[model samples]
Target: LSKFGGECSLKHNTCTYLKGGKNHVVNCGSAANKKCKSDRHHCEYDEHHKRVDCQTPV
Candidate 1:
């Protein structure tokens, strides 16, 4: 799986609601880029959440 992980590219800043809990959320990053990629541990812990796919930097 390249050891990297999935990603999410949202047009707008957003929040990820926890799958099985209330009042739990992960705020999407606001770093001028909408592409949010995950590391191994983050994806492993929350497999159901959104993630990113990035190409190698040029």
Candidate 2:
């Protein structure tokens, strides 16, 4: 099967991403907009910890 990637939307200058498994949530806020969707990266927050990062989709 193929893999699915996450996307970020500009909402009130807030960027959020979910891992879709546990309590994984990635949130990044900026005055402009989120940059994850630009390069098509699967942004996800650490489920175990409250961490944030951007990673390429599988």
Candidate 3:
């Protein structure tokens, strides 16, 4: 549980989701632009916050 600069759109029992190590964001755009993607990575968003989140979904 770490506090990002802002809130993330990734929904869960918790408001945070883990990506890579620390390249997390509130949306897919932020993650993609930040080069957070990998062979096992994928992006997702939450309309409630009008942002996005990420997961490997495996």
Candidate 4:
């Protein structure tokens, strides 16, 4: 099987949360747009946490 290195979308903002009770914190990007695209390290929300919950721009 092919190994997935790094996060899927490097551009959009990302959040790191503990997975499986501190086993590891995986960094993941917000959901994609209709076109399945994202900004480069940018987010719409002032807080990164909020950005994680907010919808990605088109």
Largest lDDT belongs to which candidate? 2
Evaluate all candidate structures by whole-model CA lDDT and list the values in order. Answer: 0.33, 0.40, 0.39, 0.30
lDDT score, residue 58, model 4? 23
| Model 3 C-alpha lDDT per residue in residues 1-58, reported as the tens digit of each score | 3322323333321223444455444434544443334433454444455644443342
1-58 in candidate 4: lDDT tens per residue? 1111122234434433333333222334434542114433222322334323223332
Which ranking of candidates, highest lDDT first? Answer: 2, 3, 1, 4
Residue-by-residue lDDT tens digits, candidate 1, 1-58: 2122322334333333334443233444556443334321122113445443232231
Q: Given candidate 3, what's the lDDT at residue 45? A: 40
Q: Could you give candidate 2's per-residue lDDT for residues 1-58 as a string of tens digits? A: 1222245443422234434452223454442333443543455544455444443343
TM-score winner between 2 and 3, please give it: 2
Worst lDDT 10-window in candidate 1: 38-47
Candidate number achieving the greatest TM-score relative to the actual structure: 2
Candidate 3 residue 29 C-alpha distance from true site, Å: 1.7
Q: How high a TM-score does candidate 3 get?
A: 0.28
Q: In order, how many clashes per candidate?
A: 6, 0, 1, 1
TM value for model 2: 0.35
Per-residue error at 55 for model 1, in Å? 18
Sort by TM-score, best first: what order?
A: 2, 3, 1, 4
TM-scores for every predicted model: 0.25, 0.35, 0.28, 0.19
